[PDB]
């Protein structure tokens, strides 16, 4: 996808304000490698805002 | 020239023998290190008695 390897910012939800890198992306959701925690979590594309 | 023989640190023929702690900190070597180990291919080796 286009979103793969793009630094994104969760702009909605419990994880709001986190900066991460998209590992996998779909039509609906996308996995984000969080820069802060040692964990990769999946969020909706509507909640993501690229830098 | 016969050849090169390894030197364990903090010896009498190592570079940092008798150097002050300030000089060691200038060389990025801590004064806390007791030496007594060889540097072979970047690996620190200890000769077990």
């Amino acid at each position: 996808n286009e979103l793969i390897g793009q630094t994104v910012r969760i702009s909605q939800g419990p994880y709001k304000g986190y900066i991460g890198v998209v590992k996998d992306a779909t039509e609906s959701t996308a996995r984000v490698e969080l820069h802060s925690t040692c964990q990769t979590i999946s969020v909706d594309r509507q909640r993501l805002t690229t830098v | 020239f016969i050849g090169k023989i390894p030197i364990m640190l903090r010896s009498t023929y190592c570079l940092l023998n008798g150097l002050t702690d300030r000089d060691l900190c200038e060389l990025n070597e801590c004064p806390l290190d007791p030496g007594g180990y060889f540097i072979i291919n970047g690996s620190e080796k200890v000769l077990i008695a």
Binding site: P14, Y15, T37, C38, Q39, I41 | -
Partner: protein, 115 residues
């Protein structure tokens, strides 16, 4: 790695009910109140208040697991008195006494700071 996020203690999600009522079938007039995303800091007071009713035959609460944030409050009341009524009266009594305590604490602050 497998660390749960810090907001799992108090934040619900879509499809999660804050309170779930399940009528017990072992004894008459008993219900299990499953409170999601809470801990002892609610169930303990609810249990203590439900013990003050003369019409509650059993008032207890337990956490199934400390790593999963939910409590179950089991209430058995006397017949002719619904346990849900006891629960909604315990909540109101707690709110009343806490508001009274807050007002009295305000009065105490005014007394202390002004001599």
């Amino acid at each position: 790695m497998n660390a749960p996020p810090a907001f799992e203690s108090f934040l619900l999600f879509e499809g999660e009910k804050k309170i779930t009522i399940n009528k017990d079938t072992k004894v008459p007039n008993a219900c299990l109140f499953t409170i999601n995303k809470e801990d002892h800091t609610l169930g303990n007071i609810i249990k203590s208040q439900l013990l003050k009713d003369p019409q509650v035959l059993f008032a207890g609460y337990k956490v199934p697991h400390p790593l999963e944030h939910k409590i179950i409050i089991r209430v058995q009341t006397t017949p002719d008195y619904s346990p849900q009524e006891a629960f909604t009266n315990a909540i109101t009594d707690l709110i009343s006494e806490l508001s009274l305590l807050e007002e009295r604490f305000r009065v105490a602050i005014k007394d202390k700071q002004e001599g």
